[PDB]
Amino acid sequence: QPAHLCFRSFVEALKVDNDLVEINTPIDPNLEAAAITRRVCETNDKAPLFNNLIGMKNGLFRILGAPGSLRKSSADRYGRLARHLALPPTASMREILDKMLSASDMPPIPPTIVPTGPCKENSLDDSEFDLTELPVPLIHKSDGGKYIQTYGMHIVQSPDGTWTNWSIARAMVHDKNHLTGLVIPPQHIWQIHQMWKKEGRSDVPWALAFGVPPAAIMASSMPIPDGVTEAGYVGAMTGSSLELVKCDTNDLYVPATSEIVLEGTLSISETGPEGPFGQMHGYIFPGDTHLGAKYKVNRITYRNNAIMPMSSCGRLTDETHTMIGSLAAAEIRKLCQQNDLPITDAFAPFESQVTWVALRVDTEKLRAMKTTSEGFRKRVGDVVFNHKAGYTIHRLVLVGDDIDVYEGKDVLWAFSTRCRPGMDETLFEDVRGFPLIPYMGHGNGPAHRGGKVVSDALMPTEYTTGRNWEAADFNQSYPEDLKQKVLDNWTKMGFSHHHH
Amino acid sequence: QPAHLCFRSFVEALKVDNDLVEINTPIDPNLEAAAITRRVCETNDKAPLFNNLIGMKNGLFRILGAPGSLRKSSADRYGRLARHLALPPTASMREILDKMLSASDMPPIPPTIVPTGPCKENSLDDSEFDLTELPVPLIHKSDGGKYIQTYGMHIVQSPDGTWTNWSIARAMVHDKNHLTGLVIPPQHIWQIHQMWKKEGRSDVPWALAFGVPPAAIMASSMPIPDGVTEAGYVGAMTGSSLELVKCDTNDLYVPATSEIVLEGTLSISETGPEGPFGQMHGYIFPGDTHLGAKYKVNRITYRNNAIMPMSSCGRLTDETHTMIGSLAAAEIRKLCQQNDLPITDAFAPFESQVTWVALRVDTEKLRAMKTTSEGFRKRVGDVVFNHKAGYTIHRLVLVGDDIDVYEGKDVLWAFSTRCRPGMDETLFEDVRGFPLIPYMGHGNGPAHRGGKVVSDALMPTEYTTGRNWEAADFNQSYPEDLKQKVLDNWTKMGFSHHHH
Ligand SMILES: Cc1cc2c3c(c1C)C(C)(C)CC=[N+]3c1c([nH]c(=O)[nH]c1=O)N2C[C@H](O)[C@H](O)[C@H](O)COP(=O)(O)O
Ligand SMILES: Cc1cc2c3c(c1C)C(C)(C)CC=[N+]3c1c([nH]c(=O)[nH]c1=O)N2C[C@H](O)[C@H](O)[C@H](O)COP(=O)(O)O
Ligand SMILES: O=C(O)/C=C/c1c(F)c(F)c(F)c(F)c1F
Ligand SMILES: O=C(O)/C=C/c1c(F)c(F)c(F)c(F)c1F
Ligand SMILES: [K+]
Ligand SMILES: [K+]
Ligand SMILES: [K+]
Ligand SMILES: [K+]
Ligand SMILES: [Mn+2]
Ligand SMILES: [Mn+2]
């Protein structure tokens, strides 16, 4: 099966790419596998595959760390991501994000039901597993539990059957047959949970699938619209209907080639201790346990020699930056265009710990609007900060056409030199805030409200007559024939490769 | 003579360091020398020495570009700066800035007058030079003149004789015997000019010395206090009295080993067109000419085979970032400590285009103050933004003891994750602003007032009981013995030098 449609094939692809290190000697799931993965993420090294995990029994389980993290070379920096999507490994971020948005104006391709698949090779009933006996990792030394769920997909369906959501939300082991996890507004797993709680009759039928088709895990990390079934979006994006098998103990459907599947229920009444967890902004607050949602596990099914993917998340750079930030930015680009705002590109700079999004403006279009900074900032912030796609983002930076928003140095240059603090900004206190940013949930104000800003790094003439400067740089401050002469004589004169 | 006391010896030191490229074939001062230097600055390459400059006659002049710019390796990144100060080439920024501050609590060592020096080897009177016939560079394609003065020292004295100031301010050729340049408040050349204009009797006696002792050009770029003679500060810093010779046509004194000296007057009545100039924030606004101060040149003296240093300034990284930003930050550190604020370190991040300064706080001391963010931000911003040392800086970022302010990635991480926009900030509109930042002089508000902010990236418990988090990073989220095991087995397992 192709790499973007089968996790097992994705792991092969990483090997073939010389982007995997297979570790066949014993590695401890208590901190060691995650420490190695953390180091990989902080250094952009090859992804680790732990084939000999202390505590693995009867096939459960090997671990792949850093599945969506960065490569060291600039030429294939985003290659792991490209390998989730059948794109060449040299694909740009623009190309990855356009691929993720492409299904937004396509008919869905609904999934195909098949009678069996690899995820049925092995099964354990409710008398035969114990989640405390599996090699679940402790990912950070102060975590409040062993976080089994950092790169699987939760599957829940609306009571009426009309919407099946796929999403990533963290969860940890509570006891032999339960997990606890984050289920918070405005996320779709929370929106669906609320529909079942209002009906009041039963717990939510649930599955959690690990090692799913890579194209599916990418859509699971993206804020596609309310009511849109991720499976049909992924089918349109890839051009193929995804093959799904029914769960054994409920009527949900999971990818046929899933590595590991948990089946059970998400309670509409019970909670249990959850967290703390080392998280995407780079922090853990030891001891900050709170009550989370509670999942009951009734059945495990799994592939022979099953592989569990894991995100060792925290400081730069991991899946919580490359996927959460970039895919939110993609959705925000589209949302702005659909609201008739002249936005061409959007990206969440890594330097901002993916808390900012830079919005590149088509300034010819802006000029024809005959507007001002105060008016335009308000319009952009009202659109984005009132929408779910803006949930995680606390600062929007508006920049003109000379800025490449995919280059954090250029975004920081424009922000620092073109946006006057205070006067060129609009603060938004009556919007939903993201409580997991430290300055929100552990800060001086309301954890769930406000703390957002639009910072206008457009210069005044960009609204009127056009850019009135040139950069004081090699590219813009010297004519073409001189530049070329310099470059052609560079190594001649004594001064100092793209792939590497 | 030692490198820090003689520019000619400094050039040798760069050679010996394998940090110079000598270019002995003809190079055009019209853009080509500056384009090569720009490229060097954007790539951290070796400094260029142009020995065959088109238009050089009778010894005037060779050019050294990038005298204070960065080296490519991390281990000697600041080595050019270290070579201005007799420090080892591996000196840290902390060590460089401490050396620059060391004379602040020392008695001055006043200069020594000697009867002659190398700067007297050649002379041209007022019938024998023409500034339009020298190989003065055009540094950026849109500049409003040929900027002779980008790395010399202006010398002016108070009318009462009690203060002799040395400083860098830009100047360009106006005609055969005049320059125009920037002379703006609150700079010491402007403060002295105003004392002569209030007296009303004559133009200001002036000299401009190029290729001065490197330790002297560093103090020329630093905002040491009002009324302090830079020569005696440099003498205390170096432990030696600087040797000076009298000008021929006035009673000012110039370094004996200066490469080139202009003698004349700075008018108290005349102005002439000045600018535009590609400047330290990375911009030029073509056509933005304004009236500047006007200098008359009566005499040129110079060394045999004289060398003119040049800064090809603009986008990162050059002397306007490494010297202006860092030396302002040093002075701000000291100013905060003298006002009893618990600041340990200060640096202007390059990523901010040296418009921010990050202030590291001794949080044990802060806790004993028993204060709040609102109160402490106001106190820090009142001290810094009301003082000349804060002139160029528009955002202060307060950070706790875990942050290395000399590392821009860590400053950006703390700012983005610990400072809630709006609530955790105090805006300052009734302070002097720096008009050369684009969002000031070319922006939406008053060019000369406001636009400043203190952003508090201290977390709430840093004011009360102490840091309550651990980083989600390799260093802090794993025990020491595990970390060491990982590192010792790194290359064994399959994964990937300090000097490089
Ligand atoms: C890539 C990724 C996405 C995580 C994520 C992680 C990763 C690796 C973890 C597991 C390592 C850390 C926690 N995560 C959570 C999370 N969203 C949230 O609600 N709870 C989370 O606990 N997300 C973000 C979430 O997947 C996106 O917001 C989706 O848009 C949610 O899908 P939905 O739009 O269908 O609700
Ligand atoms: C290193 C450096 C410093 C420049 C500088 C440049 C460089 C290379 C240039 C020449 C390339 C671009 C312009 N510069 C000017 C400047 N200060 C200012 O008043 N006018 C300027 O035109 N400065 C900053 C100035 O030297 C510092 O603010 C000093 O503190 C001034 O000394 P003072 O405290 O004695 O007034
Ligand atoms: O990093 C974490 O533990 C939890 C992340 C989280 C979340 F709770 C959300 F609601 C999000 F929308 C999101 F993008 C997240 F990443
Ligand atoms: O970059 C330029 O042309 C002029 C810089 C300049 C200045 F005018 C000042 F007043 C300063 F204080 C300063 F630090 C500067 F760099
Ligand atoms: K999703
Ligand atoms: K602006
Ligand atoms: K000075
Ligand atoms: K704060
Ligand atoms: Mn969804
Ligand atoms: Mn001074």
CB A460 within 8 A of CB A371: no
Smallest CA-to-CA distance from A28 within B472, B482, B489 is with B482
Strand A452-456 with A425-428, pairing: antiparallel
What are the helix (H) ranges across A165-311?
Answer: 188-199, 214-220, 230-238
Smallest CA-to-CA distance from A175 within A301, A293, A297 is with A297
Residue B306 in contact with ligand 4 by CB distance below 6 A: no
Q: What is the CA radius of gyration of chain A?
A: 24
As a whole number of angstroms, the distance between CA B103 and CA B109 comes to 10
Token reading at B259? 């490469």
Domains of chain A, by residue range, sit at 1-330, 331-459, 460-500
The answer to whether residue B490 neighbours chain A at the CB level (below 8 Å) is: yes
Give one word for A111, left, alpha or beta, with left for phi > 0 and alpha for psi -120 to 50: beta
As a whole number of angstroms, the distance between CA A406 and CA A349 comes to 7
- Placement of tokens 């401050």 in the chain: A477
Distance, CA of B220 to chain centre: 8
- Count CB-CB contacts under 10 A for residue A189: 23
Name which residue sits closest to atom 13 of ligand 1, judged by CA: A170
CB B62 within 8 A of CB B56: yes
Q: Is B340 exposed, middle or buried (0-12, 13-18, 19+ CB in 10 A)?
A: exposed
Phi, psi of B25 (to 5 degrees): -95, 160
Nearest to A451 among B46, B352, B423 (CB): B423
Token reading at A276? 């703390």
Residues with CB under 5 A from ligand 9 (ion): A 165, 188
Which residues of B, range 412-431, sit inside 8 Å of A by Cβ?
412-413, 416-425, 427, 429
State yes or no: cis peptide before A276, omega within 30 of 0. Answer: yes
Cα torsion through B41, B46, B51, B54, rounded to 10: -30
Within A277-374, strands assigned E span 283-284, 290-302, 307-310, 343-347, 356-361
Q: Is A127 exposed, middle or buried (0-12, 13-18, 19+ CB in 10 A)?
A: exposed
CB A45 within 8 A of CB A296: no
As a whole number of angstroms, the distance between CA B164 and CA B235 comes to 14
As a whole number of angstroms, the distance between CA B106 and CA B83 comes to 22
Stated resolution in angstroms: 1.2
- Method by which the model was determined: X-ray
Smallest CA-to-CA distance from A277 within A144, A183, A173, A148 is with A144
Do residue B451 and residue A422 have CB atoms under 8 angstroms apart? yes
Mutate to test the interface with B, among A28, A283, A372 (most CBs of B within 10 A): A283
As a whole number of angstroms, the distance between CA B346 and CA A195 comes to 53
CB B34 within 8 A of CB B310: yes
Beta bridge partners of A208: A154, A262
Nearest to B284 among A43, A412, A470 (CB): A470
CB B215 within 8 A of CB B84: yes
Token reading at A53? 């995990």
Helix, strand or coil for residue A293?
A: strand
- Placement of tokens 């990038």 in the chain: B66
B444 contact partners, CB below 8 Å, separation of at least 6: A373, A420, A423, A424, A460
Q: Is B406 exposed, middle or buried (0-12, 13-18, 19+ CB in 10 A)?
A: buried
Beta bridge partners of B210: B260
Q: How far apart are the first and last CA of chain B?
A: 31
Distance, CA of B440 to chain centre: 20
Which long-range contacts does B70-77 make (Cβ < 8 Å, 24+ apart)? B70/B41, B70/B44, B70/B317, B70/B322, B71/B19, B71/B44, B72/A496, B72/B43, B72/B44, B72/B45, B73/B499, B74/B498, B75/B498, B75/B499
Report which DSSP code applies to B78.
T
Token reading at B496? 């990937």
Nearest to B472 among A279, A409, A486 (CB): A279
CB B146 within 8 A of CB B136: yes
Chain B CA closest to residue A436: B417
Count of residues in chain B: 500
CB A87 within 8 A of CB A96: yes
Smallest CA-to-CA distance from B346 within B391, B390, B281 is with B390
Token reading at A253? 């459907």
CA dihedral sign, ordered B255, B256, B257, B262:
positive
As a whole number of angstroms, the distance between CA A376 and CA A373 comes to 5
As a whole number of angstroms, the distance between CA A35 and CA A286 comes to 18
Token reading at B365? 């001391």
H/E segment holding residue B297:
strand B290-302
CB A189 within 8 A of CB A204: no
Smallest CA-to-CA distance from A129 within A142, A113, A148 is with A148
A471 contact partners, CB below 8 Å, separation of at least 6: A402, A477, B282, B283, B284, B314, B315
Count of residues in chain A: 500
Buried residues in B184-201 as b, exposed as e (16+ CB within 10 A):
beebbbbbbbebbeeeee
CB B378 within 8 A of CB B425: no
Which residues of A, range 61-120, sit inside 8 Å of B by Cβ?
72
- Placement of tokens 């007058």 in the chain: B113
Helix, strand or coil for residue A150?
A: coil
Give one word for B340, left, alpha or beta, with left for phi > 0 and alpha for psi -120 to 50: left
The C-alpha angle A248, A249, A250, rounded to 5 degrees, equals 100
